[PDB]
From a paper:
During HR, a recombinase binds to single-stranded DNA (ssDNA) and forms a right-handed helical nucleoprotein filament, known as a presynaptic filament, which then searches double-stranded DNA (dsDNA) for homology. Eukaryotic RAD51 and DMC1 both catalyze strand displacement and strand exchange. Interestingly, DMC1 possesses the ability of stabilizing mismatch-containing recombination intermediates (low-fidelity recombinase), whereas the RAD51 lacks the ability to do so (high-fidelity recombinase). RAD51 and DMC1 are members of the RecA family of DNA recombinases and share ~50% amino acid identity and similar biochemical properties.
We next solved the structure of the postsynaptic filaments of DMC1-Q244M with homologous dsDNA (Structure 4, 3.20 Å). Interestingly, the central axis of 2D class averages, where the DNA is located, is different between DMC1 and DMC1-Q244M, and only minor residual DNA maps were detected in the 3D maps of the latter. On the other hand, the protein structure of Q244M filaments is well resolved and is nearly identical to the structure of wild-type (WT) filaments (the backbone RMSD is 0.80 Å out of 305 Cα atoms), except that the Met244 sidechain points away from the DNA position similar to that in RAD51. Furthermore, due to backbone interactions between Gln244 and Arg242, the sidechain guanidinium group of Arg242 turns away from DNA in Q244M (3.1 Å–4.4 Å). The Loop 1 reciprocal mutants DMC1-Qm and RAD51-Mq changed in opposite directions to 77% and 87%, respectively. As expected, although the 15 nt mismatch substrate is closer to the 15 nt homologous substrate than the 12 nt homologous one in WT DMC1, it is closer to the 12 nt homo in WT RAD51. As shown in the other panels in Fig. 4f, both DMC1-Qm and DMC1-PvGd mutants displayed similar properties to WT RAD51, whereas the reciprocal RAD51 mutants as well as the triple mutant RAD51-MqVpDg behaved similar to WT DMC1.
Residue numbers in the entry:
A (entry chain A), B (entry chain B), C (entry chain C): 22 to 272, 284 to 337
């Protein structure tokens, strides 16, 4: 899987070290990057930059699978529960494993509360044979109170050391620091193979919208979101991890980011408020599920019924 | 912390004094600042703008902390009491130290009275080992009667010189003067390290709403509030100070500013009137605390029971 | 104070006379005015609009005063008596000098009678070293009977020429004529420096309600009250004059204007009727004084005991 099986095909050891310096840590990463981007590194000319693909084509089929064989391949996709059974019923088992899930709401609809339950409920063996692993959290506003996890660790009856130890945390201060933080996401996913299960960005555009205030330069923000919306989709397919992002709204309402975020998101969940601690969850833009509604109440312990 | 430790890591003295000219005085202040805001200072170009960042990369980890190590880091967050124990119980210890707290009410619900007690009660050693320091006050309507402090200095039994000397005052006349006044906030926070504890803006939108009309030019204000709502969040994290702002209402009521202020605020407290001098305080949009209520009295001495 | 002191700091005579053409006649008047309101005068563009502000920056500190130094600065605030000692005791010395005071009542509670005493009692040297000066009156219904002053001039034992000569009068016919009348208020305040002490608008909303209907176009008024409620607060701070407005009521009662007037008013006095010629005065929304009551009488001579 890693860049070590290419040595027994023709590729020398002087190119392997330079290949891992750019970011490529997997064999699927060589087939996910174009030749133009591979020729932007000093030490590998076109002649030698095309020879690595020849050895990368004899490892995996560049062919056409039958759709019956593809359903056998799509049984490694897991599903992470939310904490409430009516809401998992809405998403069709929970949060998908090779996709990007978005949630947007007004201001108190429970977007940080949904992300705090997933830091606990994804370390627990649930349905479909899902074993449970560690969790990366990237927070952009400030809202990662770790004492809130010790409320949700009690209703699942797990100890507080093993639930505060499998969560890794890093705050991005700006959108460039949000960009450079995904290098350490891949470097942590690769050296610990298969014991990371999801990745949370607390908000993708708390830092994007603020930097580019001007209307005139707005277009570039759409070639810089498009960097990390496909960077994020490629990370979820090499390492088979879920991706959960949350979004804010603007003013009679619609989320921020427009059509690029709405296209690149596989599943969007709208969140609005009911009486007291009840909230409503509708489905926008899902490939399988229809537009239905549910009801989750924010309790001491996060999402419930 | 401050910028002399870059000098031993490859940066000459020739470019430090221009980084102190825009406003950056902290190692974290370069991590808060983009590579975009670092190019429009005249005299720093592209192959030399980068080497400050990678020499800032050796002072700090750009890594991923475990959440158990983050709880060890979040013991520098203090809590400032309000003046009444039932109301501190509602907020969970008082006013948080790395966040933005908002309070809105109708017209006599006690928003200026709550801000006048915090100019006295934050100079007093309270719970959690909070030592007590000085206070910045930015007032936008007119309501900073300093003789009201000499009513609240008596119920805590402190002398009147030491309670009128640790409060700094400046009135913003317009929203641009509100913007340029935060430069002197950082320049005062930096030369007196650690002996400033909070920052009060008496109202954020007494001046924002007036200059503009209605939907004629709605956009210019939501990218100009978004400047000083993240300017204010960044100041609270470099220097570890609390931020307390108050808000007005409009007409069956909801505050002014909409979703940008409602998103950027970590904690909102609604205030409404009871019989006589009793008021009610509900919680809107908190990351830890649930929606409860409490009663406080506006006595001679500010907030009481 | 006035605009000749900018001439010695780099500004030619060519651009002073156009700043005196929009209405700005004071060094503080440039600090009250944005860089936005300074561009729509034709003949002043972007690289030259800025240098007035930074040359206004050397006349004053843009800094932070200690609150002990601010109490030394707030001894130029005077207090004008009402005519009765029990009612001055309620307001804490009388009518404040850098604020907006509102009085509302049912229909015969004595709002015009209170305004007729202040045209006499403010020309008399009272408490706190208040010397006494001239008075601007803006009337909106019709009720400025000048023979009523010659009843109140007798109980203070002053002659009738010197009490009918220091009162200037102008009736606004509509709310736009109410708006354009504040230009002559500033032009009269500036050429006679320090010998004007208050400003009375007989009712702010006798004219702001006739022009607009119901809910169909409610907004065009809020954005237009908010013009002259901050226009009026800015006039009171450049020239240090009191502002007294009166308000009407509607139907179990509350005044007209809602939350914008209730926020922008520093002190509100409710007025209701007792037996015969006794009235009651309660305090709504004061920054210093508590909610108390004080009966006053409407005699031949206005307000008494
Ligand atoms: N411990 C708790 N118990 C019960 N309710 C809580 C608790 N903590 C927070 N809440 C409620 O959860 C809501 C806040 O949820 P939250 O996920 O923070 O929304 P949010 O979308 O992140 N707000 P924002 O980031 O500004 O958009 C509020 O209604 C709180 O009252
Ligand atoms: N010294 C005092 N003792 C008792 N009550 C007081 C005192 N000073 C003010 N009050 C009361 O406090 C209330 C005013 O509180 P305040 O905090 O100024 O409200 P506010 O929201 O700032 N008004 P506004 O700025 O126009 O929206 C009124 O009911 C006053 O009667
Ligand atoms: N010379 C006087 N001597 C005694 N009482 C008087 C005299 N002139 C007027 N009054 C009384 O004072 C009151 C006048 O009320 P006024 O000052 O007009 O309040 P008002 O609220 O402005 N009325 P309105 O303008 O219709 O809302 C009435 O009760 C009169 O009877
Ligand atoms: Ca949140
Ligand atoms: Ca106030
Ligand atoms: Ca009248």
């Amino acid at each position: 899987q890693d860049i070590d099986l290419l040595q027994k095909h023709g590729i020398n050891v002087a190119d392997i070290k330079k290949l891992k310096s750019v970011g490529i840590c997997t064999i699927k990463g060589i087939q996910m990057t174009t030749r133009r981007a591979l020729c932007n590194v000093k030490g590998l000319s076109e002649a030698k930059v095309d020879k690595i693909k020849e050895a990368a084509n004899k490892l995996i089929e560049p062919g056409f699978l039958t759709a019956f064989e593809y359903s056998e391949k799509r049984k490694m996709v897991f599903h992470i529960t939310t904490g409430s059974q009516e809401f998992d019923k809405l998403l069709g088992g929970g949060i998908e494993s090779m996709a990007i899930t978005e949630a947007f709401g007004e201001f108190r609809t429970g977007k940080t509360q949904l992300s705090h339950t997933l830091c606990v409920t994804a370390q627990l063996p649930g349905a479909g044979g899902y074993p449970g692993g560690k969790i990366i959290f990237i927070d952009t506003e400030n809202t990662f109170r770790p004492d809130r996890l010790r409320d949700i660790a009690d209703r699942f009856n797990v100890d507080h050391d093993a639930v505060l130890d499998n969560v890794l945390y890093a705050r991005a201060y700006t959108s460039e620091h949000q960009m450079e933080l995904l290098d350490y996401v891949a470097a942590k996913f690769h050296e610990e193979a298969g014991i990371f299960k999801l990745l949370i960005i607390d908000s993708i555009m708390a830092l994007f919208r603020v930097d580019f205030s001007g209307r005139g330069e707005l277009a570039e923000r759409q070639m810089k979101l498009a960097q990390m919306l496909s960077r994020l989709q490629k990370i979820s397919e090499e390492y088979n991890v879920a991706v959960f992002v949350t979004n804010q709204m603007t003013a009679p309402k619609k989320p921020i980011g427009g059509h690029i975020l709405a296209h690149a998101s596989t599943t969007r969940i709208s969140l609005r408020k009911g009486r007291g601690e009840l909230r409503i969850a509708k489905i926008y833009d899902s490939p399988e599920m229809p537009e239905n509604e549910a009801t989750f109440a924010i309790t001491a312990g996060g999402i419930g019924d």
